[PDB]
Structure formats: structure tokens, C-alpha cells
PDB file of C-alpha atoms and ligand atoms in Angstrom:
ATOM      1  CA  UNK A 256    -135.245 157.915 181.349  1.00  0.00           C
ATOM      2  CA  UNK A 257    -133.792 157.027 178.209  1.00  0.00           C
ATOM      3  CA  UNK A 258    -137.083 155.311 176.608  1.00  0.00           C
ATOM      4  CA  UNK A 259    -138.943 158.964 177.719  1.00  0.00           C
ATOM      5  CA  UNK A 260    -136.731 160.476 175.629  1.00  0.00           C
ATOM      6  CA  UNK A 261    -137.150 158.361 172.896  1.00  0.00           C
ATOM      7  CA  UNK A 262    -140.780 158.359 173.352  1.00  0.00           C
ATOM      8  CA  UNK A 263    -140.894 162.365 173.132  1.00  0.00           C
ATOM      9  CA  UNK A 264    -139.777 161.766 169.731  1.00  0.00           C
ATOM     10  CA  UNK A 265    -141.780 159.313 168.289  1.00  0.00           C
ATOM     11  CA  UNK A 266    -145.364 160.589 167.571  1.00  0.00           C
ATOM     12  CA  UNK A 267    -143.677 161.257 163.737  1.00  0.00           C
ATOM     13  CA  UNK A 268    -142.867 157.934 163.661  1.00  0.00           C
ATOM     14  CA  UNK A 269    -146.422 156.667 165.071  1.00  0.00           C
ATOM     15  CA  UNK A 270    -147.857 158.985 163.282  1.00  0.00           C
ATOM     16  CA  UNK A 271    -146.966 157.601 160.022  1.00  0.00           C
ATOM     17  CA  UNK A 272    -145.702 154.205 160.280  1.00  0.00           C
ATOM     18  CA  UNK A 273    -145.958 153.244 156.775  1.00  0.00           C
ATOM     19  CA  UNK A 274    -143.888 156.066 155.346  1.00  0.00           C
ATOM     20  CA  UNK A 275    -141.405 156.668 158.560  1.00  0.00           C
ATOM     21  CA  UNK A 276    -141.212 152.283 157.632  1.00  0.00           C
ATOM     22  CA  UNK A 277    -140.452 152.376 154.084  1.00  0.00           C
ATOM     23  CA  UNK A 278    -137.851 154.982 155.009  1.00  0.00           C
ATOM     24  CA  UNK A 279    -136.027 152.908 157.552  1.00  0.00           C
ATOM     25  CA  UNK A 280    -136.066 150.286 155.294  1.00  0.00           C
ATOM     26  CA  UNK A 281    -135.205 151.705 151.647  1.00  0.00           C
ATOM     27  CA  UNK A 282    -132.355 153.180 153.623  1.00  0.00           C
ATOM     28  CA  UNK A 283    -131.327 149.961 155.281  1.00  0.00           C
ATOM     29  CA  UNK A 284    -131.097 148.206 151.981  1.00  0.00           C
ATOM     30  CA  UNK A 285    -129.281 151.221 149.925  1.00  0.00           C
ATOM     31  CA  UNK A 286    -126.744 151.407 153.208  1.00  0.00           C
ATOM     32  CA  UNK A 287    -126.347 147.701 154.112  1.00  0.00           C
ATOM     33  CA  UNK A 288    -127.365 145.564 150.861  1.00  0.00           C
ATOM     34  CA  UNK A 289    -126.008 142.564 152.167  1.00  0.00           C
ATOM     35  CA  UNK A 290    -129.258 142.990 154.438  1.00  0.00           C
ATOM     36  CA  UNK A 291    -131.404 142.718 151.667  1.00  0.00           C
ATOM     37  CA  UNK A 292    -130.833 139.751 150.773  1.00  0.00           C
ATOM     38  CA  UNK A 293    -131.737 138.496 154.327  1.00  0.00           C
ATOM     39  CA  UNK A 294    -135.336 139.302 153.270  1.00  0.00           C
ATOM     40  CA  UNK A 295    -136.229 136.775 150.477  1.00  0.00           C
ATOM     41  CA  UNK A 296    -140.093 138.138 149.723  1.00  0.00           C
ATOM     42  CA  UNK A 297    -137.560 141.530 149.200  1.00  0.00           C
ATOM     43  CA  UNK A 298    -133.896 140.022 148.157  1.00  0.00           C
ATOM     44  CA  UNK A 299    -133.027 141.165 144.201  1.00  0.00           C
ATOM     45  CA  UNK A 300    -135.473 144.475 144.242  1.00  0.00           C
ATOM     46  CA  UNK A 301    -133.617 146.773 141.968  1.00  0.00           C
ATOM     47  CA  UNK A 302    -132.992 149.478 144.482  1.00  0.00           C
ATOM     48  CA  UNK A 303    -134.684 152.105 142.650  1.00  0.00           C
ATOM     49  CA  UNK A 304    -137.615 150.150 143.050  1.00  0.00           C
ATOM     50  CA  UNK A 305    -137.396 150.120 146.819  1.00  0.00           C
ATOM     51  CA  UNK A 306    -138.631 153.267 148.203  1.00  0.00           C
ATOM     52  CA  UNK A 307    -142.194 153.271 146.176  1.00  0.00           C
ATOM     53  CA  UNK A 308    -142.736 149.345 146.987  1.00  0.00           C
ATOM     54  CA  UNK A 309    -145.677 149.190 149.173  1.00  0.00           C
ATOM     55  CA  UNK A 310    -145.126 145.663 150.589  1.00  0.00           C
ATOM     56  CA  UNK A 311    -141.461 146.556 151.528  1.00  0.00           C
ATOM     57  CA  UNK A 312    -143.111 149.999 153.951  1.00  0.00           C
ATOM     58  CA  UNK A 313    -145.914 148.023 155.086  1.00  0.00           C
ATOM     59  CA  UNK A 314    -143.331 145.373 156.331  1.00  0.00           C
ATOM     60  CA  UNK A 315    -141.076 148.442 158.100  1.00  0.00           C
ATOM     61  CA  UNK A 316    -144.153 149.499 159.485  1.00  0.00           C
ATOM     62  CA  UNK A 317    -143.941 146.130 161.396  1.00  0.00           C
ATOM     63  CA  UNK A 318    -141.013 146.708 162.718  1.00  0.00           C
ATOM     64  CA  UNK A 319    -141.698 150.189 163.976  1.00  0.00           C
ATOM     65  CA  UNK A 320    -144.989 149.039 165.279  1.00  0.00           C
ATOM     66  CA  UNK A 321    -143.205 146.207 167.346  1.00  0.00           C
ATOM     67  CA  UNK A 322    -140.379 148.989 168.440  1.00  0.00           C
ATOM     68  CA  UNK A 323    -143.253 151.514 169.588  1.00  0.00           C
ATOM     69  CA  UNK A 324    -144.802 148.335 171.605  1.00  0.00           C
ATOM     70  CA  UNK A 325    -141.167 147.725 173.679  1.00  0.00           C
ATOM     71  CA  UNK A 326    -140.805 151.329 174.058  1.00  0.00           C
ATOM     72  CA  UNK A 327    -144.210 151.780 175.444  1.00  0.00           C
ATOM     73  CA  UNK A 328    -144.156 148.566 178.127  1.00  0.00           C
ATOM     74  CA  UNK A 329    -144.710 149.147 181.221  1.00  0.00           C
ATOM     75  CA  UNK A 330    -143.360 145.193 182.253  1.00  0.00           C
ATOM     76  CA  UNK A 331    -140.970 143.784 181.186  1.00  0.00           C
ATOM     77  CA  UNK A 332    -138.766 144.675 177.930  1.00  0.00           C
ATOM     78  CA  UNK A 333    -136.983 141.307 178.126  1.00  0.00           C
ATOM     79  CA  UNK A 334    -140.044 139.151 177.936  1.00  0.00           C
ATOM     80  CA  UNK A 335    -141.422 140.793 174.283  1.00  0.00           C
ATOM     81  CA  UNK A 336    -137.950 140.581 172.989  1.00  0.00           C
ATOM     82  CA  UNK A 337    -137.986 136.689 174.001  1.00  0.00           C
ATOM     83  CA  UNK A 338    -140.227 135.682 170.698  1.00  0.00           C
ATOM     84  CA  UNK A 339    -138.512 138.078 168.486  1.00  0.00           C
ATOM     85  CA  UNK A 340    -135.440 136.682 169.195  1.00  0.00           C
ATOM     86  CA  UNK A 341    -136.587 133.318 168.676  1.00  0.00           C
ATOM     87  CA  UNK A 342    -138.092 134.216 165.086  1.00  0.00           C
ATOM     88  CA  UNK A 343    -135.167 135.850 163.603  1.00  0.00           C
ATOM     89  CA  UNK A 344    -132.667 133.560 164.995  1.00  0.00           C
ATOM     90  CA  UNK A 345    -134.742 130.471 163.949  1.00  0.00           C
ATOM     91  CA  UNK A 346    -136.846 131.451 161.216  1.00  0.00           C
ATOM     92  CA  UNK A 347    -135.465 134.573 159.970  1.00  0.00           C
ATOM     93  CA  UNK A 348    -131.646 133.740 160.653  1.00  0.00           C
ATOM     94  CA  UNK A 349    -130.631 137.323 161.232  1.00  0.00           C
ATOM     95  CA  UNK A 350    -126.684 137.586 162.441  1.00  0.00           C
ATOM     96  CA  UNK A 351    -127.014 139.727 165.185  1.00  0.00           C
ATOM     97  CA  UNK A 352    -124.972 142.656 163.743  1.00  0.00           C
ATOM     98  CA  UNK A 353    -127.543 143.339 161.598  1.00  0.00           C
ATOM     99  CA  UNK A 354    -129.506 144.855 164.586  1.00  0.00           C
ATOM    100  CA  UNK A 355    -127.253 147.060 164.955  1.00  0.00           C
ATOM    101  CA  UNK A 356    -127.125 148.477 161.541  1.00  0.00           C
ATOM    102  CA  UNK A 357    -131.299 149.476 161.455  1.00  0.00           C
ATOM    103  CA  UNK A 358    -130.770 151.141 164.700  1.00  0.00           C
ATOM    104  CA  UNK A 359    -127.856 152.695 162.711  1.00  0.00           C
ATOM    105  CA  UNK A 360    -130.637 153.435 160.592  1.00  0.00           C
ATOM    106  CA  UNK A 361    -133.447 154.429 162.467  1.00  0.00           C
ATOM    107  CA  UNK A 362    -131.365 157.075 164.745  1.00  0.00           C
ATOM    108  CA  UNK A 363    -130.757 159.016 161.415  1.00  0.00           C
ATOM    109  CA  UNK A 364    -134.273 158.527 160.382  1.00  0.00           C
ATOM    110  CA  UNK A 365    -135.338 160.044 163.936  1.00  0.00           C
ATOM    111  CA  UNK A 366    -132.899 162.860 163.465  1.00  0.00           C
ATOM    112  CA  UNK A 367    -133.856 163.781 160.093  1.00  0.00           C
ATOM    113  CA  UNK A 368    -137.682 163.420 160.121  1.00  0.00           C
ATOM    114  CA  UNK A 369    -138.800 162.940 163.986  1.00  0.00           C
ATOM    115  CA  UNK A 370    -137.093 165.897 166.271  1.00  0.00           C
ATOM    116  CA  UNK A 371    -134.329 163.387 167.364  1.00  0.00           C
ATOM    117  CA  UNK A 372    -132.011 166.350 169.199  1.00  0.00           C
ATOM    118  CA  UNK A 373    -128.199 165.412 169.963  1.00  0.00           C
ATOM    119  CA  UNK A 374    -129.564 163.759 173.582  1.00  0.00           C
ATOM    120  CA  UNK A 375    -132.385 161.815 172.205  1.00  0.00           C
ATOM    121  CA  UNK A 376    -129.565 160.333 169.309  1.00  0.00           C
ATOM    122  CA  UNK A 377    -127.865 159.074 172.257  1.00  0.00           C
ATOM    123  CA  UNK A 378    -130.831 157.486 174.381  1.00  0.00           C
ATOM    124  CA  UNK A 379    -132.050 156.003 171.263  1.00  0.00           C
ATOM    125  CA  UNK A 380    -128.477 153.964 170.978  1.00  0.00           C
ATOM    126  CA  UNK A 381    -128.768 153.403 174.626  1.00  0.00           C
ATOM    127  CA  UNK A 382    -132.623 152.073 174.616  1.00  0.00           C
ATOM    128  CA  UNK A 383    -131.224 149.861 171.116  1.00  0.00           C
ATOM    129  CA  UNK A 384    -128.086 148.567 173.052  1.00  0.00           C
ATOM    130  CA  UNK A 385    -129.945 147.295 175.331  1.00  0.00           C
ATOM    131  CA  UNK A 386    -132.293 145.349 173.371  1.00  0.00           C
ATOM    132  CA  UNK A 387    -129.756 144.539 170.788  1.00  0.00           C
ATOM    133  CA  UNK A 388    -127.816 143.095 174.172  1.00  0.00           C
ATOM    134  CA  UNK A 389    -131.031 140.977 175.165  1.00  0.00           C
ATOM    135  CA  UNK A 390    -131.433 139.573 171.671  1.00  0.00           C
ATOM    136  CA  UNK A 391    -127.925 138.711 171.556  1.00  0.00           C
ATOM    137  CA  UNK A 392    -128.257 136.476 175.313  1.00  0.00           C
ATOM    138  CA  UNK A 393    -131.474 134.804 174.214  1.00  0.00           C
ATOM    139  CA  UNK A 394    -129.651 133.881 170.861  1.00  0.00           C
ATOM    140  CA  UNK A 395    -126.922 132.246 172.825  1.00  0.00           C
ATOM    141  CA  UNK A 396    -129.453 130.102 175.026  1.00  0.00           C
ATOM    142  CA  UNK A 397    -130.935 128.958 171.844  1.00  0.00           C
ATOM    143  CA  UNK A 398    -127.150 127.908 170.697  1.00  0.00           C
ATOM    144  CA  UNK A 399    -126.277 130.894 168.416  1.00  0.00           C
ATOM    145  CA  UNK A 400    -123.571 132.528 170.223  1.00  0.00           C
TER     146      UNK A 400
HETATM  147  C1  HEM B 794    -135.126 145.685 166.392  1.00  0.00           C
HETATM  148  C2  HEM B 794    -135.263 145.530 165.045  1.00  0.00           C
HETATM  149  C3  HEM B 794    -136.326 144.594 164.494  1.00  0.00           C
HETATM  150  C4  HEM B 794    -137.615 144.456 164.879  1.00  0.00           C
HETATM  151  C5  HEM B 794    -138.401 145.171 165.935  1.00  0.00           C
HETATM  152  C6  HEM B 794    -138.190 143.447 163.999  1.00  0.00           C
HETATM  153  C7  HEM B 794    -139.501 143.036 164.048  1.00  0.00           C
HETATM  154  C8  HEM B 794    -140.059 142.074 163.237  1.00  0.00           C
HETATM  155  C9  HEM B 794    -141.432 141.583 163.363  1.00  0.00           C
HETATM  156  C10 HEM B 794    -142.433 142.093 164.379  1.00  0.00           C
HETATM  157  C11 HEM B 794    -141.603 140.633 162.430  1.00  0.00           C
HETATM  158  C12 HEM B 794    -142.835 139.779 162.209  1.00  0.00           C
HETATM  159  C13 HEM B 794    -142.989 138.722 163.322  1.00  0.00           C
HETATM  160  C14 HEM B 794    -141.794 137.806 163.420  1.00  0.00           C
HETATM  161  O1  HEM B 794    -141.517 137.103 162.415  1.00  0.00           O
HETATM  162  O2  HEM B 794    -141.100 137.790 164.479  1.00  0.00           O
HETATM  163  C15 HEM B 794    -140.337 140.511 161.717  1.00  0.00           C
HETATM  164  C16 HEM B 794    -140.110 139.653 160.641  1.00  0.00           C
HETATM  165  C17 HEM B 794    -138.929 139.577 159.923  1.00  0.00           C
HETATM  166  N1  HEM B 794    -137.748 140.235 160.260  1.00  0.00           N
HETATM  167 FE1  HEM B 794    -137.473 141.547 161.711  1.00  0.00          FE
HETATM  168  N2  HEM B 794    -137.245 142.971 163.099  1.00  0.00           N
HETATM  169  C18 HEM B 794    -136.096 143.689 163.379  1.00  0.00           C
HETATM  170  C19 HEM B 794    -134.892 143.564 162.703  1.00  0.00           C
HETATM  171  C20 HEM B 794    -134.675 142.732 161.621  1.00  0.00           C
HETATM  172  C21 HEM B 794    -133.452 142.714 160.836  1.00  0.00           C
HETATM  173  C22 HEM B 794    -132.261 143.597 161.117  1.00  0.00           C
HETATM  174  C23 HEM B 794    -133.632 141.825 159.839  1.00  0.00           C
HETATM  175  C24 HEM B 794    -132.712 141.472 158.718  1.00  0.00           C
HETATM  176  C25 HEM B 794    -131.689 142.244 158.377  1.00  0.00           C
HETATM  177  C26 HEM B 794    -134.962 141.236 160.011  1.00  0.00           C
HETATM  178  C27 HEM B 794    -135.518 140.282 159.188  1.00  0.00           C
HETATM  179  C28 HEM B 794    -136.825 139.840 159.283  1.00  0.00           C
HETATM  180  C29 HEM B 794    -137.418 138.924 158.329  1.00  0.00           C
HETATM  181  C30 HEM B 794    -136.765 138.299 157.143  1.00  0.00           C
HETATM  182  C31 HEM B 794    -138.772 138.761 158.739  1.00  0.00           C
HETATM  183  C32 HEM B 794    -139.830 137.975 158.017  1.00  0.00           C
HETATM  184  C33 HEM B 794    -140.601 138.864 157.031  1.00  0.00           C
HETATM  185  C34 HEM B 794    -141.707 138.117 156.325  1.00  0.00           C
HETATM  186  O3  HEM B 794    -141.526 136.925 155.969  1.00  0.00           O
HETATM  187  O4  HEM B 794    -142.788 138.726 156.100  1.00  0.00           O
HETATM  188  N3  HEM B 794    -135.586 141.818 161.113  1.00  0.00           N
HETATM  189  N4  HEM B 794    -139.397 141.387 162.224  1.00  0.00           N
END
């Protein structure tokens, strides 16, 4: 029930992934700059320079594209999340807080721009805690507990 909720929210998001992208992810960086600096093509961007760069949206739009994907499966959730894990904690080296802070993030974003009432805030943490929670075990069976 909780990724039906979510999903009753998001055709502003998939409407615009670019912008709705660029949003989540200027606002990442202004909130969380350590996070910034996780991105090298992005790390050192004067953060006034953020919210107009195109590469940094079309990258966000990535993201939400890859969220709107897991929301939208009708298998399983686990399975998608299985290379994603294995990119960010191998390529990417992402701590695994910082998944928590863009769903931070992105549960404003909803709020502010996609209809996200006071239930759909909370199934959006719910649907994000558990695949923040999935992440997290396939990080520890590749030995980064
Ligand atoms: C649930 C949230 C996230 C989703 C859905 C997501 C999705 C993606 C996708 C689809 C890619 C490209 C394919 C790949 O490399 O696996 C990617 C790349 C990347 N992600 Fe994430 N990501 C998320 C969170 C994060 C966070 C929190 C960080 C760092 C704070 C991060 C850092 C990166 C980096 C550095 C790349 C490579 C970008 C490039 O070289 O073009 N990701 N992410």
C-alpha cells in the first residue's frame, strides 16, 4: 500500500524528471555538502552554480528515473536494488547514511512540488526504509558492514 501512495504522487515527478532532478539534487548538496564531494564529475561546484547546471539535473533525473522503476515493479524490489548496491558500494563508495539524507530530500521535494499530503510523507519514508534497509544487507554481503 505504501508504494500506491507514493505512486499517486509522482506523475510531477515523472512528469518532469529533469527539473523535479536538479531540485533533489541542488538541495542535497546545499543541505548535505559533504555529499557533494562524493560526486567527483560535481565535487567543488560553487553552489550558486548548482541549480542552473544541466549535467548535475540530468544526473538527478537518473536517480528519479531508477526510483520511478522500483516503485513501479511488479517483481521483486530486492533484485533491482542488487546492482545499485553493488555500484555505489564498489564504484561509487557511498556510506550508507547518505541514502538516507536524499530521501530526506526527496520527501520535502514531494511535499513542496508533487502533492506529497502528511500520509504520503510517511509511506514515502516507509517505501525508502525499506530500500535503504536492502542496500544496507547487500552492502554487508559484499563486506561493507
Ligand atoms: C536511492 C537513491 C539513489 C538512487 C536511485 C541512485 C541511482 C543511481 C543510478 C541509476 C546511477 C547510474 C548507474 C550506477 O552507477 O549504478 C547512479 C550513479 C551514481 N550515484 Fe547514485 N543513486 C542514489 C543515491 C546516491 C547517493 C546518496 C550518492 C552520493 C551521495 C550517489 C552517488 C552516485 C555517484 C557518484 C554515481 C556516479 C555518477 C557518474 O559517474 O555519472 N548515489 N546512482
Amino acid at each position: 500500500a505504501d508504494f500506491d501512495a507514493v505512486l499517486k504522487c509522482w506523475g510531477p515527478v515523472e512528469a518532469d524528471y529533469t527539473t523535479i532532478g536538479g531540485l533533489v539534487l541542488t538541495r542535497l548538496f546545499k543541505e548535505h555538502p559533504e555529499t557533494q564531494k562524493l560526486f567527483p564529475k560535481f565535487a567543488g561546484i560553487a553552489q550558486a552554480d548548482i541549480a542552473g547546471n544541466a549535467a548535475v539535473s540530468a544526473h538527478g533525473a537518473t536517480v528519479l528515473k531508477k526510483l520511478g522503476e522500483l516503485l513501479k515493479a511488479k517483481g521483486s524490489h530486492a533484485a533491482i536494488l542488487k546492482p545499485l548496491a553493488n555500484s555505489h558500494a564498489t564504484k561509487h563508495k557511498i556510506p550508507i547514511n547518505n541514502f538516507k539524507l536524499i530521501s530526506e530530500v526527496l520527501v520535502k521535494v514531494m511535499q513542496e512540488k508533487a502533492g506529497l499530503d502528511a500520509g504520503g510523507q510517511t509511506a514515502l519514508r516507509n517505501v525508502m526504509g525499506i530500500i535503504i534497509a536492502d542496500l544496507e544487507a547487500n552492502y554487508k554481503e559484499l563486506g561493507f558492514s
